[PDB]
């Protein structure tokens, strides 16, 4: 209690900071597999530098890279089946995550 209570509340603060750090590591993994796909499989014109110069949010950059990768690898029939529509312009989200997972499977089997 008292002194030790406030120090253990600071410990709870440490727990919160560790949770934030783990969330950042998850961001690292996701966004980083996305960036590796983007560099390895997409044109230099879709680089983060030039897109930021054109003035797009980084989330917009990631979703654009994901959509381009899905169009490049995943077939149109698979897009029309999983995403239920041909156009991917409004399919950003969990369905986009499934599509990019399918694209990763496609490139793995392509190699």
């Amino acid at each position: 209690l008292s002194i030790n209570e406030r120090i253990t509340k600071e410990l709870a603060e440490v727990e919160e900071r560790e949770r934030i750090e783990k969330q950042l590591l998850l961001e690292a993994e996701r966004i980083n597999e996305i960036d590796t796909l983007a560099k390895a499989h997409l044109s230099n014109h879709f680089n983060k530098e030039v897109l930021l110069a054109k003035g797009y949010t980084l989330k917009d950059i990631m979703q654009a890279q994901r959509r381009e990768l899905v169009r490049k690898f995943v077939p149109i029939e698979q897009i029309k089946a999983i995403a239920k529509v041909s156009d991917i312009s409004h399919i950003d989200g969990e369905i986009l995550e499934q599509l990019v997972s399918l694209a990763k499977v496609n490139i793995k089997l392509r190699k």
């Binding site: 499989h41 997409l42 044109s43 381009e68 490049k72 392509r110």
Partner: peptide, 19 residues
Amino acid sequence: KTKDTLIDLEQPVNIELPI
């Protein structure tokens, strides 16, 4: 020419921006 390897030329292309 697209952003692909020399062996990937055999595989078809669905949608891409050429280099």
